[PDB]
């Protein structure tokens, strides 16, 4: 396949532990971005086979998408909020390094990233 196996979304050997920031990342950040009208290209891994993108996974070193992030948050996969914020940043970076700067998809990514960054600016303190 041109497509890699999707990222792992659950960790069978980690304790269940919430934090205020992880709660915020699921209930405010992911929830807001997921329902946005421009979410759909980002709700699942890029299907390079179906879209016929033979170079996508040659260019992108670290696949990431909001479907994966959502499942990770729901499964308490992350030990800390910074891991989750990292995944969001990776997802945006992938879009911006692969897609042509004039492409609709980049516009969609920018709208979502603006919202993401606004919410991160209101991230609760880790206490």
Curated annotation (Swiss-Prot):
It is linked to Cornelia de Lange syndrome 6: A form of Cornelia de Lange syndrome, a clinically heterogeneous developmental disorder associated with malformations affecting multiple systems. It is characterized by facial dysmorphisms, abnormal hands and feet, growth delay, cognitive retardation, hirsutism, gastroesophageal dysfunction and cardiac, ophthalmologic and genitourinary anomalies. CDLS6 inheritance is autosomal dominant. The gene is BRD4. Phosphorylation by CK2 disrupt the intramolecular binding between the bromo domain 2 and the NPS region and promotes binding between the NPS and the BID regions, leading to activate the protein and promote binding to acetylated histones. In absence of phosphorylation, BRD4 does not localize to p53/TP53 target gene promoters, phosphorylation promoting recruitment to p53/TP53 target promoters. Transmembrane segments: none annotated. Residues 17-123 form the Bromo domain. The NET domain mediates interaction with a number of chromatin proteins involved in transcription regulation (NSD3, JMJD6, CHD4, GLTSCR1 and ATAD5). The C-terminal (CTD) region mediates interaction and recruitment of CDK9 and CCNT1 subunits of the P-TEFb complex. It is also required for maintenance of higher-order chromatin structure. Interacts with p53/TP53; the interaction is direct. Interacts (via CTD region) with CDK9 and CCNT1, acting as an associated component of P-TEFb complex. Interacts with RELA (when acetylated at 'Lys-310'). Interacts (via NET domain) with NSD3, CHD4, BICRA and ATAD5. The interaction with BICRA bridges BRD4 to the GBAF complex. Interacts (via NET domain) with JMJD6 (via JmjC and N-terminal domains); the interaction is stronger in presence of ssRNA and recruits JMJD6 on distal enhancers. Interacts with NSD3. Interacts with NIPBL. (Microbial infection) Interacts with bovine papillomavirus type 1 regulatory protein E2. This interactions may serve for the tethering of viral genomes to host mitotic chromosomes allowing successful partitioning of the viral genome during cell division. The chain holds residues 44 to 168 of 1362 of the full protein. Coiled coil: none annotated. It is found in: Nucleus; Chromosome. There is a cross-link at residue 58 (Glycyl lysine isopeptide (Lys-Gly) (interchain with G-Cter in SUMO2)). Chromatin reader protein that recognizes and binds acetylated histones and plays a key role in transmission of epigenetic memory across cell divisions and transcription regulation. Remains associated with acetylated chromatin throughout the entire cell cycle and provides epigenetic memory for postmitotic G1 gene transcription by preserving acetylated chromatin status and maintaining high-order chromatin structure. During interphase, plays a key role in regulating the transcription of signal-inducible genes by associating with the P-TEFb complex and recruiting it to promoters. This is Bromodomain-containing protein 4. JQ1, a thieno-triazolo-1,4-diazepine derivative, and I-BET, a benzodiazepine derivative, have been tested on tumors with success. Treatment with GSK1210151A (I-BET151, a I-BET derivative) has strong effets on mixed lineage leukemia and promotes myeloid differentiation and leukemia stem-cell depletion. The record marks 99 as: Acetylated histone binding. Belongs to the BET family. Ubiquitously expressed. It comes from the Eukaryota.
């Amino acid at each position: 396949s041109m497509n890699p196996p999707p990222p792992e979304t659950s960790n069978p050997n980690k304790p269940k532990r919430q934090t205020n920031q992880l709660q915020y990342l699921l209930r405010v950040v992911l929830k807001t971005l997921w329902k946005h009208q421009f979410a759909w290209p980002f709700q699942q891994p890029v299907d390079a086979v179906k879209l016929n993108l033979p170079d996508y996974y040659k260019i992108i070193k670290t696949p990431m998408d909001m479907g994966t992030i959502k499942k990770r948050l729901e499964n308490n996969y992350y030990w800390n909020a910074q891991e989750c914020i990292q995944d969001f940043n990776t997802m945006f970076t992938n879009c911006y390094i692969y897609n042509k700067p004039g492409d609709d998809i980049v516009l969609m990514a920018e709208a979502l990233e603006k919202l993401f960054l606004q919410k991160i600016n209101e991230l609760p303190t880790e206490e």
